Subunit: 106 residues, 3 copies
């Protein structure tokens, strides 16, 4: 999918997690977010389509998704353990990473 | 190692996992696959040798291995928990990613 | 932060882990190492400032941190399970990657 579609997936599933009641919903949502973040890594944001995909900004863009992926990893492990409230708290910490990339490249 | 040898390692250890009896065999094989996937990420596949190193195709190639590595991650955790058949099923799900990359770059 | 600051964080926290007596010391140190390794991925080392940003050497540099991150991952899970000596042995295994990257690019 393209970048905006992956962002919609990330946003949709983050809201599923906030409102979630059971670990299965959270595990499923974080799994879709992991796939969306990996797919987004291969995109070029519109404010960067004017650089080499190897520019330092583009590498900063892709590493931003690696940072997001390690945070999703921590949350998905909590969801796998059934720690539903802790997983929701780890998922809320994602938005710092969301906000930092948006400030630079959105 | 070269890309050919890493692909041999991936394929051979995938077979080892299918025939495995115990979790230590699955854990050992998956750990070798993780190392091979990381090493493969450094390669330029023959289909892309005559394109720019800064091409979006090279980025998509490397992200293909990130996708594989996160699926290897899930299987390896199952093996570390002693869940042999679940780890084996998670490893069989690698083949979707193997083939998706092959359709593009093999 | 710049590359040298990230290296100082990696080096300082590896020493903390070697001297740690409890799992919380190790968990906190590895968590800072993970953040530093991800940040270092954005850098261009002085020895490679003359290379194209997507050159095989720059790719090798960035994948070296991916290798480091998966080893940090294993050590951090062991620390989270309270296996302190095991987590310390896993962190000692990081040095092979530190030394291999320095041999090539420092
Ligand atoms: C960079 C590393 C990013 C991270 C991490 C996240 N987002 Fe993002 N997002 C990014 C860009 C460059 C853009 C602009 C895309 C464009 O074509 O304009 C976006 C966009 C969004 C949007 C709006 C989508 C749209 O249709 O316009 C949303 C709702 C969004 N992003 C949400 C979001 C969430 C919830 C994130 C973390 C969980 C997140 N983004 C991370 C770049 C990056
Ligand atoms: C891209 C991101 C790939 C992923 C994921 C996997 N493979 Fe692959 N493979 C890829 C390429 C570009 C090539 C051609 C290499 C060449 O030099 O020709 C291959 C090749 C193979 C082969 C046969 C080639 C050989 O080793 O001589 C096998 C058996 C193979 N690949 C297996 C394999 C498996 C089992 C994978 C998933 C677990 C897998 N590959 C993923 C690119 C990519
Ligand atoms: C490449 C993939 C590297 C890995 C993995 C590690 N390091 Fe590193 N380190 C790297 C470079 C290119 C440099 C040179 C930076 C420069 O500007 O000269 C370094 C440097 C260091 C230093 C010295 C920092 C300074 O004050 O100049 C230290 C103390 C250091 N690195 C430690 C270190 C440790 C402990 C690592 C593993 C945990 C490690 N590095 C990995 C490249 C890479
Ligand atoms: Fe994990």
């Amino acid at each position: 999918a393209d970048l905006e579609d992956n962002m919609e997936t990330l946003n949709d599933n983050l809201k599923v997690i906030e409102k979630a009641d059971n670990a299965a919903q959270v595990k499923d949502a974080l799994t879709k977010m992991r796939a969306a973040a990996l797919d987004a890594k291969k995109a070029t944001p519109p404010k960067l389509e004017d650089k080499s995909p190897a520019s330092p900004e583009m590498i900063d863009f892709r590493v931003g998704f690696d940072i997001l992926l390690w945070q999703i990893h921590d949350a998905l492990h909590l969801a796998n353990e059934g720690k539903v409230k802790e997983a929701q708290a780890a998922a809320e910490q994602l938005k710092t990473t969301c906000n930092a990339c948006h400030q630079k490249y959105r």
